[PDB]
Structure 1
Amino acid sequence: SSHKTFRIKRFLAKKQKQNRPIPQWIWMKTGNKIRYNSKRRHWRRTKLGL
């Protein structure tokens, strides 16, 4: 909501920053296996639960 606690507004901010694609130079790394960020979240498909 608009009414927010500092603790919640800080938890939500960290969940916002983790929701990005991987850098493309990570692919060229020597022993790389990651193809994409498998931990992507969508506000509508799955809920943070808090």
Structure 2
Amino acid sequence: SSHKTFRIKRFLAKKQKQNRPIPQWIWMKTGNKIRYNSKRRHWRRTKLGL
């Protein structure tokens, strides 16, 4: 809703910031196993709880 509270909006802010892909330079590292971001979330598919 548009009638958010501060803690809910801050939680949504963090979950917005975690929803970006991995930077390109991390898999040029030596001890690297990550191919992509597997913890990604789409707004239509996964409904974040709440």
**TM > 0.5:** yes
3-state SS in 2 of match to 1:27:
helix
Gap runs ≥5 in structure 1: none
How far off its partner does 1:25 sit? Answer: 0.3
CA RMSD of aligned residues (A): 0.4
CA separation in 1, counterparts of 2:9 and 2:20?
19
The count of residues paired between Structure 1 and Structure 2 equals 50
The percent identity for this pair of structures is 100
Give the TM-score of the pair, scaled to structure 1: 0.97
The structure with the greater share of residues assigned to helix is 2
Query: CA deviation digits over 1:22-49, x for unaligned, max 9?
Result: 0010010111000000000000011111
Output the TM-score relative to the length of structure 2: 0.97
Moved over 4 A (4+): none
CA displacement 1:1-42 (0-9 Å, x = unmatched): 100000000000000000000001001011100000000000
